[PDB]
């Protein structure tokens, strides 16, 4: 039985850790809402 707790304001924070890449991927979305890689 699920419950929620507040974890912060939703704010852009200048000088946050910058990381991650920007990959262009070919994908398919099925009726169950699962993404898959098309190759």
């Amino acid at each position: 039985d699920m419950y929620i707790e507040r974890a912060g304001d939703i704010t852009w924070e200048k000088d946050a850790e910058v990381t991650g890449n920007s990959p262009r991927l070919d994908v398919a979305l099925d009726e169950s809402g699962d993404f898959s890689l098309v190759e």
Binding site: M2, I4, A7, G8, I10, V18, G20, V27
Partner: protein, 156 residues
């Protein structure tokens, strides 16, 4: 229940201790999460009850107390921030330039940051702090890593 705008953890006690199953966004009195977090189940906010209002397993989205409110879009150019809320750990902004999911029905923003599955539903933000969609539905890549769509609903 707490109806203050912001980001919230979604917790269960149906397992060992208190387990974080995901995250969501409260905005204009509506709670927004991913379908795979709640499976459409009702939620508690203290002694208050949140009932599902709208849901779609294909979008992997669900809203509580009212219709989907979040309509901001990734501009296709600018960096974004994942406001990650990991299990046991404080809210943290991570800034990133999204990649792109190419599908038969159009292109979608994608973010390549590893976090546990319990982070699913964390909001992705634009430079004005608007929620452009949620993190937690995507694909596993050659590396073994995870890439999440920027999943956004429709406002009516």
């Amino acid at each position: 229940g707490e109806t203050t705008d912001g980001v919230y953890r979604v917790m269960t006690r149906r397992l060992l201790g208190s387990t974080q199953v995901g995250v969501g966004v409260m905005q204009e009195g509506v709670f927004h999460t991913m379908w795979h977090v709640t499976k459409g189940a009702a939620l508690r906010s203290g002694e208050g009850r949140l009932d599902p209002y709208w849901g779609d397993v294909k979008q992997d989205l669900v809203s509580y107390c009212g219709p989907w409110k979040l309509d901001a879009a990734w501009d296709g150019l600018s960096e974004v921030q994942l406001l990650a809320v990991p299990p046991g750990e404080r809210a943290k902004n991570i800034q990133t330039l999204p990649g792109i999911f190419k599908t038969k029905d159009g292109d979608i923003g994608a973010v390549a940051l590893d976090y546990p599955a319990g982070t699913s539903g964390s909001p992705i933000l634009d430079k004005c702090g608007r929620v452009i969609g949620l993190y937690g539905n995507g694909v596993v890549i050659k590396n073994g890593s995870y890439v999440s769509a920027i999943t956004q609903g429709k406002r009516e």
